[PDB]
Amino acid sequence: FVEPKWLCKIMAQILTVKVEGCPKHPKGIISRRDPKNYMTQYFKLLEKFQIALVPSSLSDHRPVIELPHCENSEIIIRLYEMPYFPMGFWSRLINRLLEISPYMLALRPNRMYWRQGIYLNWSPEAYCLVGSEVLDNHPESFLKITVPSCRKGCILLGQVVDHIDSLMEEWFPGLLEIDICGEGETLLKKWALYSFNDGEEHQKILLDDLMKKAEEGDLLVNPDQPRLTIPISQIAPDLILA
Amino acid sequence: PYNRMKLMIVGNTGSGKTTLLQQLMKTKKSDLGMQSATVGIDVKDWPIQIRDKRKRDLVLNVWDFAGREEFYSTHPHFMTQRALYLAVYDLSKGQAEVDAMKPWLFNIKARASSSPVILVGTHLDVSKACMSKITKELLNKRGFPAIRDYHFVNATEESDALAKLRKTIINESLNFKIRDQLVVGQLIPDCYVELEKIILSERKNVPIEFPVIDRKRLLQLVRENQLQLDENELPHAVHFLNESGVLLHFQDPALQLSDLYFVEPKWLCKIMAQILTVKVEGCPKHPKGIISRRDPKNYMTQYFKLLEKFQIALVPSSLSDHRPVIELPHCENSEIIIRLYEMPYFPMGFWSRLINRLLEISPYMLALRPNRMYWRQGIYLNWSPEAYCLVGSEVLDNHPESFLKITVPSCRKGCILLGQVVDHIDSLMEEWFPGLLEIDICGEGETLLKKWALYSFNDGEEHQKILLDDLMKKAEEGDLLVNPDQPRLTIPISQIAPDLILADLPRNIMLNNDELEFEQAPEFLLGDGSFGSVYRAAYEGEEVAVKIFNKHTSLRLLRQELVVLCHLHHPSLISLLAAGIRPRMLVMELASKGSLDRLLQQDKASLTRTLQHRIALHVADGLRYLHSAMIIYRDL
Ligand SMILES: Nc1ncnc2c1ncn2[C@@H]1O[C@H](COP(=O)(O)OP(=O)(O)OP(=O)(O)O)[C@@H](O)[C@H]1O
Ligand SMILES: Nc1nc2c(ncn2[C@@H]2O[C@H](COP(=O)(O)OP(=O)(O)O)[C@@H](O)[C@H]2O)c(=O)[nH]1
């Protein structure tokens, strides 16, 4: 591509072409509606540039999902508290998990991805909701991922946390960068959520992954009241090769 | 005589509804220098003492419905059939508002077909009056209800233009005449009119914070007076006062509030709309539409012990209009079953009712709940890529109608969902909007709701799925296959509409006509009972008793009965063996020795004090199971 100012202009002509006709489709999806073989070359580059379905300008309003089993003990959760969603994060993320239909391996799951989530589900016993909510009294931006704690779910978590990390260090490598000056804030604190009470715990206690990974000398976690304990397999089945 | 009617006022976010009514009733004060938009429906009543030869002092209560599009989810509760509906243009936006008023006229037609309508152009002060053309061209006699007049009042001051409207409301009321009855002047027992006078006289003596009355307090009001009504009269009496809008009361058994008697309707109708306006300009920690119990003495508990009872609880309205892009797993034109429901306009309380009838059905494939994602006009509850159901709503191209597309995977677990959603969506259509599915023999049988079915001979890449009306296709039950004018290739009807064919019910009860040997016409095989309807036949080489159905039971009900018979399965309950069409018959076991009444009527010597017991033991064994499945026989 000689004359960069041209390609950089073409890739943004698609993100402005609206239609004030009939919204026969939901917001964000669009079919090939337009010269000499160039139109064919066009989205032989846009699709190559991942912008094809337009993962941006896509239904910001999220739809109310009601997960089947949500009793505080069947779900695994892992936040990704970061101060701001990086610029091209979601359109990159939801286009890395999208093209992975061969989970549980080629049975594609019927998914419903808004701007900042995917929620591709095979069955009420195996799903994965890579959402994004805002907590209370918190100006950060989180990335909640809820997965059923069964066997078919321990795979999805350990397989999404990979893609979401293979993207973080490939594209935004200064997020996960130890700033030894001051203190090691690291700018991205991948929390994990656990609760001793299986249900009605009234809260899921945060637990930094860095501190919890160092708790591999044993296999169980437990509070300052050491009567009851949780196997790490349940709360973070990716650090343990489960 | 009972002189009391309902005069519903109807408009849309800006009209002479609450400012035309104040002049119709001739409210001289209207002290509020500046009033606000309506919340709820504002039930009021004004008497009309017609100072004439006829001393009939009729009093009709007005219900000036709110126009804002967020209360529409609750209006179909209060659009009854004994009423004279109004309608208001706002002619200032001439020829563009009459279009925006078709939905109201349509819901009036859906709810109360046999009621009049009086279009009332509310603006003259501000300008365009050729709108009488379109109302005569498109709005007069095309599927919409019977418009009986149309006026162009000023709606802010008394005038000759308005006075002649007040006169039409009278003459149209005194000539209501549904099925030649003249409703406004019927005769009723004075025991009701006196019951009407005490409730009104009690409306002044009730806690304003909760004007509700319990039946205990009610059964004492009749004791204070000398009312001759008994416990068998009130359930009818207090209902006839309901249709007249004196008090609200709901006899539904599921909604466990039938002890609550809502006097002062204008209050309950206002409370149910306070929830639909309370917003929060704080933090959108939740998606749009969902909300938790964030708010006095135990009333808040009673509050959504009524809202949930009123289905408004998750608020199925004001919920994420924008739909999310779903990408179904198998969508290759041959694995999906589709069935449109082309209707001219979505009725008022359709979706909030529909998505709350399928929602509460988690025991599909029966208690495994599927993780669902329901926007305003869809559900898409899915168990697995092999079993899902998307009750969507899209708008086709070059079509002003409103469709209800339902796509389901064509497998076995999917043939059930279609045959189980089409039931709920029909049990709702005839229960709530019975004038939609009403054959208008005048003109032609448009039927106002054309439930298409979609089929394609090419499994994939058909480039289109050809429409096929269900009424015409149901008549193609003489055979089992459909095929085009090029009769080489053909489609089994099981694939395109597995509900007309009894393919959704358990697979063991398919008729399999190849083995059923049965002679309907003769009577010497109709031996069961005496001059009855259930015959005798053979099925799989064994003796059975088929039950031919007459013209009464429609297929939608036969399919509704088999679903409960199919899962009893007790050695002391007549069990099904098959059920099919051609004709609509039902196969069961053949009780060789006939019913019991015929035995002890002519064979009283066969009961031998140990057969008298095994009979009573097998009947008490059936009741031991029916009462276990929470179903009472009611006739033994
Ligand atoms: N499964 C069966 N096997 C043998 N006889 C039966 C069976 N079911 C019903 N009968 C006989 O059929 C007769 C009529 O059946 P049905 O259930 O229609 O009774 P009904 O409602 O009194 O009759 P109808 O509806 O025809 O007036 C009864 O007298 C009963 O003796
Ligand atoms: N000038 C004029 N104003 C009107 C007329 N009808 C209604 N309005 C105004 O519009 C408002 C009417 O309230 P309304 O729309 O009936 O409430 P809603 O219909 O219940 O939402 C009031 O502010 C009136 O002053 C009219 O005929 N002429």
Coordinates of C-alpha atoms and ligand atoms in Angstrom, one line a residue, chain B residues 14-19 35 37-38 122-123 154-156, ligand 2:
Chain B
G14 CA -51.2 15.1 22.5
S15 CA -54.9 15.6 21.8
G16 CA -58.1 16.9 23.3
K17 CA -58.5 13.9 25.6
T18 CA -58.1 15.4 29.1
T19 CA -58.9 19.0 27.9
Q35 CA -52.3 20.7 33.8
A37 CA -50.0 14.7 30.8
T38 CA -52.0 11.8 32.1
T122 CA -59.8 18.2 18.3
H123 CA -58.2 21.2 16.6
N154 CA -62.5 23.2 19.3
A155 CA -61.8 21.4 22.7
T156 CA -61.0 24.5 24.8
Ligands
LIG2 N1 -55.1 25.4 21.7 C1 -55.5 24.2 22.0 N2 -54.8 23.5 22.9 C2 -55.2 22.2 23.3 C3 -56.4 21.7 22.6 N3 -56.6 20.4 23.1 C4 -55.6 20.2 24.0 N4 -54.8 21.3 24.1 C5 -53.7 21.4 25.0 O1 -53.0 20.2 25.0 C6 -53.0 19.6 26.3 C7 -54.0 18.5 26.4 O2 -53.8 17.5 27.3 P1 -54.0 16.1 26.7 O3 -53.1 16.0 25.5 O4 -55.4 15.8 26.5 O5 -53.3 15.0 27.8 P2 -53.1 13.5 27.3 O6 -53.8 13.5 26.0 O7 -53.8 12.8 28.4 O8 -51.7 13.2 27.2 C8 -53.3 20.8 27.2 O9 -52.1 21.5 27.4 C9 -54.2 21.6 26.4 O10 -54.0 23.0 26.8 C10 -57.0 22.5 21.6 O11 -58.0 22.1 21.0 N5 -56.5 23.7 21.4

